[PDB]
Design an enzyme around this catalytic site. Structure first.
Site, mmCIF file in Angstrom:
data_model
loop_
_atom_site.group_PDB
_atom_site.id
_atom_site.type_symbol
_atom_site.label_atom_id
_atom_site.label_comp_id
_atom_site.label_asym_id
_atom_site.label_seq_id
_atom_site.Cartn_x
_atom_site.Cartn_y
_atom_site.Cartn_z
ATOM 1 N N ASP A 195 0.829 -1.219 0.000
ATOM 2 C CA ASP A 195 0.000 0.000 0.000
ATOM 3 C C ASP A 195 0.863 1.270 0.000
ATOM 4 O OD1 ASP A 195 -2.640 1.024 0.058
ATOM 5 O OD2 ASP A 195 -2.412 1.453 2.249
ATOM 6 N N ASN A 239 -11.483 -2.242 -3.739
ATOM 7 C CA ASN A 239 -10.537 -1.329 -4.438
ATOM 8 C C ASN A 239 -11.181 -0.890 -5.771
ATOM 9 O OD1 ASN A 239 -8.531 -1.522 -2.423
ATOM 10 N ND2 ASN A 239 -7.459 -3.149 -3.497
HETATM 11 C C1 LIG Z 1 0.717 -7.228 -6.152
HETATM 12 C C2 LIG Z 1 2.207 -7.105 -5.965
HETATM 13 C C3 LIG Z 1 2.722 -5.759 -6.292
HETATM 14 C C4 LIG Z 1 1.860 -5.045 -7.277
HETATM 15 C C5 LIG Z 1 2.306 -3.650 -7.560
HETATM 16 C C6 LIG Z 1 1.438 -2.598 -6.972
HETATM 17 C C7 LIG Z 1 0.186 -2.393 -7.747
HETATM 18 C C8 LIG Z 1 -1.030 -3.097 -7.200
HETATM 19 C C9 LIG Z 1 -1.117 -3.098 -5.730
HETATM 20 C C10 LIG Z 1 -2.237 -2.315 -5.171
HETATM 21 C C11 LIG Z 1 -2.222 -2.382 -3.674
HETATM 22 C C12 LIG Z 1 -3.499 -2.023 -3.019
HETATM 23 C C13 LIG Z 1 -3.463 -2.193 -1.522
HETATM 24 C C14 LIG Z 1 -4.539 -1.372 -0.872
HETATM 25 C C15 LIG Z 1 -4.850 -1.761 0.507
HETATM 26 C C16 LIG Z 1 -6.160 -1.131 0.955
HETATM 27 O O1 LIG Z 1 -7.244 -1.451 0.363
HETATM 28 O O2 LIG Z 1 -6.082 -0.233 1.811
#
Ligand SMILES: CCCCCCCCCCCCCCCC(=O)O
Lengths: 215, 200
Positions: free
Chosen positions: B16, B64
């Site tokens: 995140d 999301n």
């Molecule tokens: C999946 C491995 C790495 C991927 C690279 C980053 C791009 C996608 C990741 C998005 C992360 C989202 C996490 C959010 C957590 C939340 O909902 O608060």
């Protein structure tokens, strides 16, 4: 005094056996000193207008411990419920009552009970298990939607803020459905060393969260 | 790399902070996700090197997908690239998520059963906690049943919450929060989390 308050606070009153050992006491002897801190958290929550507090009492797995500790945490749990019962709360106890381990003394709080003036919900998890909670549903429900709104803890709503004493950052199976989005604040001091500032810092942390960021 | 006394069997990663990372650099909110791909590779490389058995990456959830379309495309594309870059390595890949949606990338459908059976890398893609638990309609019938208990969950971007990651597998997880945003990943972030884990 806070702009933003959590609707519902979960408390994990951990560190009792460490606190006692550190003090020159026996492990089982810290639990008796966890009763007062609970009553003080209740006091501050009433005072600022927190809607609902859930205390983590003991699990089904906790009862696999030495009998001298089981007796001690069980008695301390029984007395905390009885003492909040002497105040101005709507009390609810959630746990597996289909077991001799569930204390007789707490059966009368297994449906929400108003005491004194009311207007604060206090919940206690007593002979609780996450697996028991989730599967309470799976047994004889029409569908997935019915299964989830019929978990054993269904009366307990989503947790906004979870505060854990004793310095461990883990949920220990507390209310997995209600804690999916909970912000977790860890106090390093053991539960019997509870100070008001512990709760005030946990509430500043909650207020300080960036509400633009989503779940 | 430190010598570790004990290591977790199963690490969960919540990558995140991508949007705040981009804003702090004068970029657009959606323009941080693509800078999260290489950090995924760095974590993978360190985990194989020290012999961690299983890593689950939080990719994106159904929640999301409520985010603006321009953000959704950036995080979905970055998740697809991250699964592809790991698929080139010597890893047993599993993607768990709701495939009964326009949102689920057709590119990742081939990972919805574990590849190279015999390091395990899991990705949560269009995953939802409610969708997971209701999938049976018990421990062994939830959508994520192939993913075992998480020992250590590491979250970047400073927030101390699960955001609905794997409610069943996280019940006893030790949680370590890195204040830096995911694109600011450094090897020492993962080492400090492992030092935390072995101290429990
Ligand atoms: C999946 C491995 C790495 C991927 C690279 C980053 C791009 C996608 C990741 C998005 C992360 C989202 C996490 C959010 C957590 C939340 O909902 O608060």
């Amino acid at each position: 005094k806070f702009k933003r308050l959590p609707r519902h606070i979960a408390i994990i009153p951990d560190g009792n056996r460490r606190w006692a050992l550190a003090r020159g006491l026996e492990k089982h002897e810290g639990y008796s000193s966890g009763i007062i801190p609970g009553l003080e958290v209740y006091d501050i929550c009433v005072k600022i207008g927190i809607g609902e507090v859930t205390f983590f009492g003991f699990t089904q797995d906790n009862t696999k411990r030495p009998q001298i500790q089981r007796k001690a945490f069980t008695d301390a749990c029984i007395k905390s419920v009885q003492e909040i019962a002497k105040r101005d709360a709507e009390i609810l106890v959630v746990g597996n009552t289909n077991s001799d381990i569930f204390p007789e003394e707490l059966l009368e709080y297994t449906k929400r009970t108003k005491v004194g003036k009311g207007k604060i919900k206090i919940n206690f998890l007593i002979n609780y298990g996450w697996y028991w909670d989730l599967t309470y549903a799976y047994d004889n429900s029409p569908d997935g939607k019915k299964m989830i709104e019929n978990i054993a803890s269904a009366e307990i709503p989503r947790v906004d803020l979870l505060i854990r004493w004793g310095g461990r950052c883990r949920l220990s199976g507390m209310l997995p459905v209600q804690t999916v989005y909970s912000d977790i604040y860890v106090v390093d001091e053991m539960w019997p060393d509870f100070k008001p500032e512990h709760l005030f810092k946990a509430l500043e942390f909650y207020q300080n969260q960036d509400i633009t960021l989503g779940g």
